[model samples]
Target chain A: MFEQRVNSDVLTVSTVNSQDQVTQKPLRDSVKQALKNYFAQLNGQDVNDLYELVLAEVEQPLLDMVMQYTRGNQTRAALMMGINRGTLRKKLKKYGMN
Target chain B: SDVLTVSTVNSQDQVTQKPLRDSVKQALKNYFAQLNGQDVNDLYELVLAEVEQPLLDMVMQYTRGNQTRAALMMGINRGTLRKKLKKYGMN
Candidate 1:
């Protein structure tokens, strides 16, 4: 069973196997783990626009994959994303993918 | 330059480091590779949901649940942050 919990302190994702052992692996953990590496690599250097950087990094691949999956069908991709066609187009343009 | 050192070290670090961007890229790569042309719907929303919850969680935790401070830290408007928190049932 896969269960996800988003709480005030942390986001936990867990899965249970047939042997009843629990494993925790979630996209949240990936982001956190990655951030840890990033910060460690910074070595006390100043960081700017981190939120924007992370957002662009994640959003770019997501849009790329969905667009590739839809074969450039903007309308279908927008519909599948549950976002407005204009919004999707704006994002694509934001990433210069349009 | 300090920035250059960061990049150079990061490039080498990639051998063992999985930055958030690269992690997302790799995950999606594996996802599509396994899809085998199978149809996927709501994938955009699903991935976003997974990513946003953690992003928001981290920011809130960093700010110790201070909405104004978290919004400022994230460079987002307080209203927008509130909306997102509500969307994730974090509010």
Candidate 2:
């Protein structure tokens, strides 16, 4: 996953010229907080811990959608993801959907 | 083993390697093990659902709840984070 991916509406939001708002939507924040609380409490994670654990865990849903978008089409997914077909296939197999 | 740890932080850093979650997971597994018997097939869903929360918790912890930093920490682009945040039902 590439870092620094810009949102399509990042600049459309309220901001001064050459300004980045870094807007945090309340709705999104609520869900994010809810999920965080669930994971932290359920996992018995200390307040200081529990970030990466959640992100990696949620990747499953995203992967499922991507695979579904292409209808389990590896080649196209790879193209969209800008990765090799083999790499894409390998990930598919790793997720046990291969 | 810390050898198999997911992420590592150096001394003087607030963040550290992951392992604490193992305790909670083991407990969950054991609890479920007593319920109608143990089955990896059925347990698969149980684990996935359970893991989702902790995964997000850890990622946010690492990035201090800053989605931008969290996204990068998770090795994902912000756009990917946006999409994922949406998918994660963040909105």
Candidate 3:
């Protein structure tokens, strides 16, 4: 249902040519699809730290984008991200973004 | 240049594309752009929930709803998985 809604919204807003299909899938579907492929590749191998792995992948990009949006202003970035400056700084340090 | 494409082949022969990181970046960019400088109180938690719920759901489904196996697969303790499940109302 969510995927359908997003696809419909994309179709409504964007020009759809034969070669360029503007299908902007929801983030949930993207994550689910990515996981399906991840598990398939694992082929029954036990996954370790899968939760952290996925979170870090998503979080890094999220932080990077927010910081870029804020133009390296920590206060604004922290507010935008709804995190305390200290916590945001720590995360940036963790990912070596700081 | 921010867009990084990750391509994978699904069960079908079709190639699935889009990097999870790039998707996240795009989503956040759109989100902040849409907000237009409005104060966002929970963007961090909001995005984390968006990704975590699906991650947990997919892992649970992959493990066939076995909490212990799912926890093990995720390298998290059973209690932690239970906590997360309850938080998401999935348990």
Candidate 4:
């Protein structure tokens, strides 16, 4: 469900070569720490809470746009995403901002 | 001692608060959650970072990689996008 009234997948993706080849652990930790410190600086906000907010607001449309380009087909979304349909669908349902 | 002034010469060191980017990413994550509580793990951070880059990339792509379009899509200012591009080092 999750507000599926506007289920138009628009997956117009252009692959960009990465100039930086970094791993997830470091960037992930930095992003996490950044989020943690971010919420901490927000005066009593929790790291997890802030993280969830950004995911819903910004990431939802981002994924939805990609999905829409694929015509709401989870398989193409998964292929373009380099992930599995199950994972992609699970994520789409997770971020209700769509 | 000097009194704090609103017009004081700002430095990047002065603007380095975690609340901003944290909230920036958080706003998206929470909105996208669909109230499932499925993104509370380490994956949130990892996904958010990659999400930002390509989201930035895609929005820019949508706008022909123009910062102005990116900012407009994000509902910020061209000047703000100028600043963010400097911060994130994205085109």
Tell me the TM-score of candidate 3's A chain: 0.77
Error of 1 at A90 (Å): 1.9
Compare the candidates by lDDT and give the number of the best one: 3
Model 2 Cα shift for residue B45 (angstroms): 27
Docking class of 2: incorrect
Worst 10 residues of 1 chain A by lDDT: A6-15
Query: In order, what lDDT does every prediction score?
Result: 0.66, 0.45, 0.74, 0.44
Cα RMSD for candidates in order: 7.0, 17.7, 5.9, 18.8
List candidate 2 segments past 4 Å from native: A1-31, A39-52, B1-91
Correct interface contacts retained, every candidate:
0.36, 0.02, 0.68, 0.00
DockQ of candidate 4 relative to the true structure = 0.03
Which structure among the candidates has the greatest TM-score?
3
Over the stretch B3-91, how does candidate 3's per-residue lDDT look in tens digits?
Answer: 22345444455665666787677666666665766777777877777777888999889989999889988889999999989998997
Report the error of model 2 at residue A57, Å. Answer: 2.9
Over 4 Å off in model 4, which ranges?
A: A1-41, A44-47, A96-98, B1-91
- Candidate 3 structure quality by residue, lDDT tens digits, A8-43: 122111112345555455577667767877876777
Rank the models by TM-score, top first.
3, 1, 2, 4
Question: What TM-score should be assigned to candidate 4?
Answer: 0.31
DockQ of 1: 0.26
Q: Residue B42: error of model 3 in Å?
A: 0.5
Candidate 4: tens digits of C-alpha lDDT, residues A46-81: 222322444455455546555655577777666655
